[PDB]
Design a protein around this ligand. Structure first.
Ligand SMILES: Cc1cn([C@H]2C[C@H](O)[C@@H](COP(=O)(O)OP(=O)(O)OP(=O)(O)O)O2)c(=O)[nH]c1=O
Ligand SMILES: [Ca+2]
Ligand SMILES: [Ca+2]
Ligand SMILES: [Ca+2]
Ligand SMILES: [Ca+2]
Ligand SMILES: [Ca+2]
Length: 900
DNA sequence: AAGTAAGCAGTCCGCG
DNA sequence: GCGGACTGCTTAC
């Protein structure tokens, strides 16, 4: 097989590389790599190396990497550009793997671990590591085993061995319900003392050295804690055995009341699953505890126990160990669903970077572009410093707040990347500038044509047309990858809808789910068999379809994020190819495109309806337009439709057969006007929205920019079994809005759009009556808590103190002199509740760590003094009043003559 | 750990 | 009490 790297490091003048050899074995080597860098040279001097602008360069081969670094410094002292890849391990990978990498994940050691540490005096600071590590569960992907290291004797109590038999039993039998599918995969090792546990752990780690190291909060807790505890017991050299090259670096970002640090283990790639989740999931969660995310992702219940975690080991060591194991398994289950490890490997190997560099789109693109240019003996420019400067972005149209009955939306496929490709925007393709007219003049096609030679953006930039830039070339490659995975995602979605329909009529039989590939639209044969299936089999198929859709979503959305990150990187001062001319060329062309096509669509539709000056485009954000379809429906007349699906078909057909060609014609003209390299503005129908045929539903409404709701029947070609709400910006979509309030507001919106005013009034009246029974957590607001110290003045609110910070200070006073009470962690999220006048907490609100129950000391009092009136008015009534006045409806019945 | 636009909550304070 | 300047947070692209 083809060799591939596992990890790469620079240590002094050596490269340290772990890799898989041509026989599939893991190997490690130290290489005295001799890097090259480049200097401009005179024209009359034969060379094969040129900078991206066509200037000749000479290669400088250095005796070692330190020599290369020192040369860079001296070139700065002289005042001359030192060209080439200054990150020498990326140059090493490029030289060593000069082909597209095929990797075999089954040869990559992926380790997932979690530790337990009993602490009677609060949170056990990793930087101090003053308490014994009393459990480690370490899952190894190559062995497919959970290795359990259990401390039986500690100064905080001596315990009995964990029992695998009890662990397997149902909770109703007194057991821990450790999932049966992992019971046989557990290798349990009890230890008489902490020193032998850790020594055996290090020996094990030597045998089975992680390549990818993950788990939950491992980078900020488990790794630094394990490292520091070993350092404190045995000394530094023993702690450094966690690195296969025995090298580590401390970081220390720190607060001022807590120390903290991260530990870099050379030759390991740490991908903390919490950071993977935050980067790749596109959720914003009220809490990031493993319990909370596990419940969200997997619908598995909380791991329940009595008493604080600080007494769990002594009271119930059996459960204590079982929960440690289950915690490790939960992360694996999340990854089986979300496939973020697979994603990271794919993207890392594609770019030829350290896998952990996938967190940095700047590093990722710098490596992609370097590899691409190196292929042609081209030499990358030196990175420079630039002052940070603001620049303009997208256009957003101000909507008229209103209900909108029938709506069709359209938006550009991969807008910014498509602009880059169409215009040919790249560091090396800049051809000059032209004299700019106001944007309005380009939008209305009255400005003079910018160029008869070059490809233009309305910000005044011109680009060569003879050849593609490296940015367009490389962005196209990831775009095509994106497009393939989205294809699979959407087929899985459409397949899911077929299953939902069939579920209306399940058959009474004993049968099996079909062995099918959900990434491809079901054939006629598959459809027929499905209509014959039982409810059990259909549900299993729906589950599998939905898992396939999620896998597709991960692959496509993060590739979309990578290419959009390239457009954004052009406006970050740390990117090698930072250029505000190029970043603004993209954003300014975008503003033009939206307003240009708005004009075109209005003109087209006024023509087809025989009107003048009518606005059909009611809204638009960045690269999208929302078209009012009322007149189109009315042209045929509502009474002509058999059912909802009949008009959805009609609008779908109108969008595809009339509007899209009109849209395409408008954009081709714009492409010619701008003399662009290639027409790539593709504005496809997104949504078809409206009320259910014959109902009093209003279909949709806007309150303002980036705030709207639509009742959608068809999304990008997926025809839903049941209508789905598309809600953007409104309170239902914000992590800060209480959970039960999100749910209530969503139902109010559902009723508005699908059923009408009276249905809304029914629900409101009931919600208002019953809501005081809602669990306090479900009605708590949520906020991030930054700068707690800044606003703390002897335990009281300082000037301009934010509402959520005030709550935290209230909490801090109420728990003072208690090392057991959970502390609020700077920068993490809190639940927030308003408090009634004259409460014992002596302020207007209280806040506590999110995803948790408030500590028992104050729980009863918080419940007693919670201000339900303020809660209701602030989180529910106020947003609802905004929705209903926008939509011209009342949430409460107004008096009328009939009352008599 | 790529970017900008823009919304709402809340503090402080004016507004005769 | 509403709106403007400002901070804080969060979302749509
Ligand atoms: C979502 C997102 C969009 N944008 C910008 C660039 C996008 O091209 C533009 C429009 O956003 P979207 O319409 O959300 O995305 P897209 O057009 O890139 O891809 P799709 O094919 O799924 O529509 O807004 C970002 O800069 N960063 C982002 O994270
Ligand atoms: Ca734990
Ligand atoms: Ca788009
Ligand atoms: Ca059937
Ligand atoms: Ca869009
Ligand atoms: Ca689309």
């Amino acid at each position: 097989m083809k060799e591939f790297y596992l990890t790469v490091e620079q240590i002094g003048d050596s490269i340290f590389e772990r890799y898989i050899d041509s026989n599939g074995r893991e190997r490690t080597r130290e290489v005295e790599y001799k890097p090259s860098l480049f200097a401009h040279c005179p024209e009359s001097q034969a060379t094969k190396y040129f900078d991206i602008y066509g200037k000749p360069c000479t290669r400088k081969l250095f005796a070692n990497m330190r020599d290369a670094s020192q040369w860079i410094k001296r070139m700065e002292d002289i005042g001359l550009e030192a060209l080439g890849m200054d990150d020498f391990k990326l140059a090493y990978l490029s030289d060593t793997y000069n082909y597209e990498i095929k990797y075999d994940h089954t040869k990559i050691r992926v380790a997932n671990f979690d530790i337990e540490v009993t602490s009677p005096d609060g949170f056990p600071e990793p930087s101090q590591a003053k308490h014994p590590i009393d459990a480690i569960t370490h899952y190894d992907s190559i062995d497919d085993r959970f290795y359990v290291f259990d401390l039986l004797n500690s100064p905080y109590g001596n315990v009995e061995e964990w029992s695998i038999e009890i662990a397997a039993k149902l909770q109703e039998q007194g057991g821990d319900e450790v999932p049966s599918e992992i019971i046989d995969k557990i290798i349990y090792m009890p230890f008489d003392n902490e020193k032998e546990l850790l020594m055996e752990y290090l020996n094990f780690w030597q045998q089975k050295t992680p390549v990818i190291l993950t788990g939950w909060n491992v980078e900020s807790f488990a790794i630094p804690y394990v490292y520091n505890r070993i350092k404190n017991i045995f000394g530094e050299s023993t702690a450094k055995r966690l690195s296969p090259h025995r090298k580590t670096r401390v970081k220390v970002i720190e607060n001022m009341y807590g120390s903290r640090e991260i530990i870099t283990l050379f030759g390991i790639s740490v991908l903390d699953y919490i950071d993977l989740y935050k980067k790749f999931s596109f959720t914003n969660q009220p809490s990031y505890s493993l319990d909370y995310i596990s419940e969200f992702e997997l619908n598995v219940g909380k791991l329940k126990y009595d008493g604080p975690i600080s007494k769990l080991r002594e009271s119930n060591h059996q459960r204590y160990i079982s929960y440690n194991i289950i915690a490790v398994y939960r992360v694996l289950q999340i990854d089986a669903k979300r496939q973020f490890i697979n994603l990271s490997l794919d993207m890392g190997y594609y770019a030829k970077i350290q896998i952990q560099s996938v967190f940095s789109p700047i590093k990722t693109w710098d490596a992609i572009i370097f590899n691409s240019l190196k292929e042609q003996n081209k030499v990358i420019p030196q990175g420079r410093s630039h002052p940070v400067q603001p620049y303009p972005g997208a256009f957003v149209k101000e909507p008229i707040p209103n209900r909108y009955k029938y709506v069709m939306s359209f938006d550009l496929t991969s807008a910014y990347p498509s602009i880059i490709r169409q215009v040919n925007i790249s560091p090396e393709t800049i051809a000059g500038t032209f004299k700019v007219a106001p944007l309005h003049d380009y939008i209305n096609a009255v400005a003079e044509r910018p160029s008869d030679v070059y490809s233009c953006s309305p910000n005044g930039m011109m680009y060569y047309k003879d050849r593609d830039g490296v940015v367009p070339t490389e962005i196209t490659k990831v775009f095509n990858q994106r497009k393939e995975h989205k294809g699979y995602m959407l087929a899985a979605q459409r397949n899911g809808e077929i299953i939902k329909e069939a579920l209306h009529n399940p058959n009474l039989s004993v049968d099996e789910p079909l062995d099918v590939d959900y990434r491809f639209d079901f054939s006629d044969e598959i459809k027929e068999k499905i209509k014959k299936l039982s409810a059990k089999s259909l549900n299993e198929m729906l589950f599998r379809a939905q898992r396939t859709e999620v896998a597709g979503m991960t692959a496509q959305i993060n590739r979309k994020a990578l290419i959009n990150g390239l457009a954004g990187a052009l406006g970050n001062v740390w990117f090698r190819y930072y250029d505000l001319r190029n970043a603004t060329a993209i954003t300014t062309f975008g503003q033009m495109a939206l307003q240009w096509i708005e004009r075109k669509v209005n003109e087209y539709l006024n023509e087809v309806c025989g009107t003048e000056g009518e606005a059909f485009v009611l809204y638009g954000d960045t690269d999208s337009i929302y078209v009012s379809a009322d007149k189109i429906i009315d042209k045929v007349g509502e009474s002509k439709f058999r059912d909802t699906n009949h008009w959805v078909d009609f609008l779908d057909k109108f969008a595809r057969e009339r509007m899209e060609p009109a849209i395409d014609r408008g954009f081709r003209e714009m492409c010619e006007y701008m003399n662009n390299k290639q027409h790539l503005m593709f504005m496809d129908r997104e949504a078809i929205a409206g009320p259910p045929l014959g109902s009093k539903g209003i279909g949709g409404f806007w309150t303002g920019k980036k705030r709207y709701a639509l009742n959608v029947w068809d999304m990008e070609g997926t025809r839903y079994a049941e209508p789905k709400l598309k809600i953007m910006g409104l309170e239902t979509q914000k992590s800060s809005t209480p959970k039960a309030v999100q749910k209530a507001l969503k139902e109010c919106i559902r009723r508005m759009l699908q059923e009408g005013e009276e249905s809304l009034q029914e629900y409101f009246k009931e919600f208002e009556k019953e809501f005081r029974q809602l669990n306090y957590i479900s009605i708590a607001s949520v906020s991030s808590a930054n700068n707690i110290a800044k606003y703390d003045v002897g335990g009281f609110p300082g000037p301009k103190c934010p509402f959520h910070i005030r709550g935290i200070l209230t909490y801090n006073r109420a728990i003072k002199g208690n090392i057991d009470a959970p502390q609020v962690v700077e920068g993490e999220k809190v639940y927030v509740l308003p408090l009634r006048e004259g409460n014992p907490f002596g302020d207007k609100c209280i806040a506590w760590p999110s995803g948790t129950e408030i500590t028992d000391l104050i729980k009863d009092d918080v419940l007693h003094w919670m201000d339900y009136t303020v809660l209701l008015e602030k989180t529910f009534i106020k947003p609802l009043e905004g929705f209903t006045s926008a939509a011209k409806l009342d949430y409460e019945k107004k008096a009328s003559l009939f009352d008599m």
